[PDB]
Amino acid sequence: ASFRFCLECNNMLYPKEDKENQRLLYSCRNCDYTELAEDPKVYRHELNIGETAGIVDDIGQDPTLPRSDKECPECHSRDCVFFQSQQRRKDTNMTLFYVCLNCKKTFRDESE
Amino acid sequence: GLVCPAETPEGQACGLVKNLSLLSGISIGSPSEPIINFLEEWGMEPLEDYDPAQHTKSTRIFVNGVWTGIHRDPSMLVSTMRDLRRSGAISPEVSIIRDIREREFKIFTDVGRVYRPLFIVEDDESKDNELRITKEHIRKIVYGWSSLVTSGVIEYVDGEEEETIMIAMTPEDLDTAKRIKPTFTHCEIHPSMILGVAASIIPFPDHNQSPRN
Amino acid sequence: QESAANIVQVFKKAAPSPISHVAEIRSALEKGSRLISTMQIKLYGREDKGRTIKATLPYVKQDIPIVIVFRALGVVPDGEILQHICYDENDWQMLEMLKPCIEEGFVIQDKEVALDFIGEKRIQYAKDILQKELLPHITQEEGFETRKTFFLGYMVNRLLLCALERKDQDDRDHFGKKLDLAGPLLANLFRILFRKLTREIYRYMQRCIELAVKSTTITSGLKYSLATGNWGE
Amino acid sequence: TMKEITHAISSAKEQVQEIIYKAQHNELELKPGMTLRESFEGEVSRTLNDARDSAGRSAEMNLKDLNNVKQMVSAGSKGSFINIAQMSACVGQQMVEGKRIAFGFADRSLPHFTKDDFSPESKGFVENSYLRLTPQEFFFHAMAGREGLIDTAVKTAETGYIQRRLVK
Amino acid sequence: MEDNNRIISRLWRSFRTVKEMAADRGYFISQEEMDQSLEEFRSKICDSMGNPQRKLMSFLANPTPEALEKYSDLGTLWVEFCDEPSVGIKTMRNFCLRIQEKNFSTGIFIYQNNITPSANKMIPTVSPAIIETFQESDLVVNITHHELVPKHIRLSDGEKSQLLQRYKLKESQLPRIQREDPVARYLGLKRGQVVKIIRRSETSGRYASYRICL
Amino acid sequence: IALDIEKAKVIQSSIYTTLKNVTSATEIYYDPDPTSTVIEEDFDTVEAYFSIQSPWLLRLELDRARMLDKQLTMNQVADKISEVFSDDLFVMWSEDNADKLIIRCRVIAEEDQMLKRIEAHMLDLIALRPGISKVYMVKHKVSVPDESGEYKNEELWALETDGINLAEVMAVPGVDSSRTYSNSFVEILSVLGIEATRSS
Ligand SMILES: [Zn+2]
Ligand SMILES: [Zn+2]
């Protein structure tokens, strides 16, 4: 989605239809500003984002994390740290995400 | 570490009455400012004027439950306060927790936080891979416990700060008779210290059915 | 005597309830009177129905929809409100959630009305409950409105951070977040006493149409407690 | 025999490391009605249990018709298999609320552990015998017994109420 | 075949059940009249395509040679069905009257989905005779048939005034049974009637209990 | 039918799966032309659906692995959907072969508000295959009379539920409304007569 606000009075953007011309508009109900549609996509629900949870480079300084001696799919190092999805869902899965002390990649262990 | 697992009354109130381990102690109540100041002068751009997008992954910092602004690269803000405590310039009683996995900085002066003591590990060996303390400090024991702390050889870890450290059991190690045994930041003074007055008199409490102890 | 104060907690509230999740923070001045009023940043609309966010303030009958709490604070435009809550313009999910909320307050467009809907006589009281009752720790001064706002933002954040399965419900029994030893006890106790002495010394001064301090309330008061085991007077 | 057992825990340890590898790859299907995660436990549990079960059984048949403890068990005057087991072989798996020692500390059993350690040495499996527990084992074990003591101190009077009612 | 092939299969089981209840109540009925296979049933109460017309199912029945021996005045019963999946207070008078004149004593309407609150508010309006209402979806399976359901039985005001003398009972001291009880309805009890229950017992083989209907 | 393995299943799925449990995501795009899309991976799905409305769109992306578990069909799924709303909601869908399952649709004064209330009414008030969730199968020990007299081992499949409705799950073709049993005695009494109730 990545929606938009508006210059002038920085507010929320509500959409309206370009009847006579057939196309999408976005607007404001505080002033008058109006801009065409950025994308035909308007709303999403999604019933897989957030597994990578904030991974500052410093994620190699959190001593409470495990050490695996594999080798990323790019730099071919041997100092990686890991975990499971941070998506706290009793129905999630258990695949390992790895970060490398020599890049900051995101390679898994998955195979399906 | 903080409370004895065994000593606790049967029936009625059971678990609502806890006894302290031998090593545990309670915080007392330090002052905030000598650390609020010590901060907004070492990288702490005050909350007052904040901009969420210019400062994206800005690690936010808290003081006794108040939000005193964020900080840019913290990795150092961290291993500076920690060096400040070990020399003894920010009471060994204060708690500092860095939760990278969320980008935040916990500051605790509070009065009533149970804490225990541990040996510091620090891979500080330009001669190998080790407990800051050595067999020279030992046999040296005008050398109290106040010095074992004023030299950064031991730290007071409250339950919160505990969360972000890695403790090694047997300092050393970490026969067909003995019990089969299976990043470190601290080591355990001694496991037999997780016990309080009560169990401390029990012989081989590590050989009886726990409910009996 | 063993739950610590001034801290953010988020709890999931059972399938049978108009509320989904809620975040709380018990607040009290570490030194000075010490109020025991907590902040409730609710989240109506169960995990289905077409999901607003309202919060509870001290002395206010009903609850207020976070948007207003912001404009009533000193932040009047949208997106400047989302400014405080969310710290990553590329997190549409969270932001989405907020959307319906913004609509709630879309009817109040400024600081005038903001502090109003909280019922000239009424508007003035609105302020009060914000400078001396609202998240009273931090400080109850005046020109810090901004600060509390970032909190209520850090809070509304913590709420969602969970309602989106990214952070678990707060561990109620994580010992680190819980012991008033002897020294402290005498404290809360002494005050209760010295304060009756304080307003006692006020009566001798309110009769002299022109010594008095009965230093027995602090001696005998202390004894009673320590003797039996009944703190409170 | 004290050896034959050790390696019935080692092998049992790997039949766990094995299904953990095969889970950290999504190489297993969800047994209808159960969560992919839950189904992971369901096996670990059924693995350690069967391990422990014979661990003791090796000693059971290893105690002659002169072993006093055995005698006091056959007579039927005190204790049972289980008892011998936990004293000469393996103490067992510890547990509260039905699941092996939780993660009170974000993603770990004790601060002495690496995050996300789902193994048995972390979730509360005391591999040691009373005759021989390691801190970890010793602790979990306590957390397990602690649950026990709990209801023996709760069901004690609520049971009495339910009783009282039936009477009146 | 669509999903209407089944809305027949049921109307049929619901039927046979009615019958059974009618013979158990204490009326005439052949085991066959109950065993009318689904086959030989279709072609009997259907029109064209393959839909069943109920207005033609309703029927009467009467007190067996025996029933007149214990219960004298037990009148004649009448079971009725209707094609109106929502029958109301109007199509009602057709029932309320049809018997108040023929003079039976037992009315039994089988409402498909539901009768109107205006309607049924005209039942206890024609005594001595009495009328009952049974939902369709509740007679698909004869409940008596269940494993746990033990056999019940009515009792002449003779067999009753006996139990009482024989046990020295004050009526109230007798185990009761609800008027709106599934079985109570099935055998069509009334406030004051008794019922002997006879079930298997892992202690004696058979025990004999009694429930009066409050 | 006693040890009829497949007969077991055949009843299981006849006794609760909702659209909500097979939908990976749902989006509402703006497509004003009822004869082509602003979407790529959809094109085909239009043209191949004109041989043997509102400009507002609503797309659903169902799960593949989820359609094999509770077992379902686009034909069915939609069939249901369609007959749920009926003549005031035109709906379409791809075919089980594709590498992306989808379902487009439109209605028939402010539509962005309506086509959103109909977002829920789709994910929480629509069943595919009440109070009867999970339903497992089991092979039980049932002693029984051999023709030759002696009692012998004749295990038979049985369906255990995870919820309770009786009056209804009783009149289902394929069960024995003479043995059914819920531990909810409260119910039993209401359905089978206080007596049977006691028994429970
Ligand atoms: Zn504008
Ligand atoms: Zn790399």
Tab-separated table of C-alpha atoms in Angstrom, chain E residues 9-10 13 137 140-143 145-150 152 176-178 180-183 197 199 209 211, chain F residues 167 170-181 188-200:
chain	number	residue	atom	x	y	z
E	9	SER	CA	-35.019	-39.057	2.390
E	10	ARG	CA	-35.626	-37.167	5.601
E	13	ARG	CA	-37.782	-41.066	8.174
E	137	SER	CA	-36.529	-31.530	12.014
E	140	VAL	CA	-36.360	-37.327	11.845
E	141	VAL	CA	-34.969	-39.814	14.314
E	142	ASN	CA	-37.234	-41.544	16.804
E	143	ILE	CA	-35.647	-40.593	20.107
E	145	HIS	CA	-34.804	-45.668	19.703
E	146	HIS	CA	-31.730	-44.390	21.500
E	147	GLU	CA	-29.402	-46.609	23.519
E	148	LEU	CA	-29.770	-44.613	26.704
E	149	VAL	CA	-33.520	-44.221	26.346
E	150	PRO	CA	-35.202	-46.875	28.529
E	152	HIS	CA	-41.516	-45.919	29.427
E	176	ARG	CA	-41.351	-36.616	38.326
E	177	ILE	CA	-40.973	-36.044	34.573
E	178	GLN	CA	-41.246	-32.774	32.632
E	180	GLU	CA	-41.884	-30.680	27.752
E	181	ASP	CA	-39.747	-33.815	28.220
E	182	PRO	CA	-38.741	-35.400	24.859
E	183	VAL	CA	-40.208	-38.771	25.839
E	197	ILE	CA	-39.823	-46.888	33.359
E	199	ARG	CA	-34.470	-50.386	32.211
E	209	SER	CA	-38.947	-46.844	38.280
E	211	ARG	CA	-42.220	-40.788	37.059
F	167	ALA	CA	-30.525	-32.335	17.685
F	170	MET	CA	-28.051	-36.772	14.876
F	171	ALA	CA	-30.231	-36.847	11.747
F	172	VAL	CA	-27.220	-37.157	9.442
F	173	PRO	CA	-27.158	-39.992	6.860
F	174	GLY	CA	-24.459	-42.436	7.966
F	175	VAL	CA	-24.642	-42.377	11.785
F	176	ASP	CA	-26.363	-44.506	14.391
F	177	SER	CA	-28.778	-42.175	16.265
F	178	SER	CA	-29.001	-45.080	18.744
F	179	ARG	CA	-25.398	-44.803	19.948
F	180	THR	CA	-24.388	-41.177	19.419
F	181	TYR	CA	-23.081	-39.641	22.657
F	188	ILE	CA	-28.590	-35.601	26.259
F	189	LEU	CA	-31.424	-34.924	28.701
F	190	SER	CA	-32.906	-32.247	26.463
F	191	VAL	CA	-32.792	-34.488	23.408
F	192	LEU	CA	-33.305	-38.050	24.662
F	193	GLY	CA	-35.477	-37.610	27.782
F	194	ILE	CA	-34.361	-37.110	31.375
F	195	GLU	CA	-33.900	-40.874	31.648
F	196	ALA	CA	-31.209	-41.133	28.994
F	197	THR	CA	-29.963	-38.005	30.659
F	198	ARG	CA	-29.485	-39.807	33.983
F	199	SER	CA	-27.677	-42.591	32.146
F	200	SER	CA	-25.133	-40.016	30.966
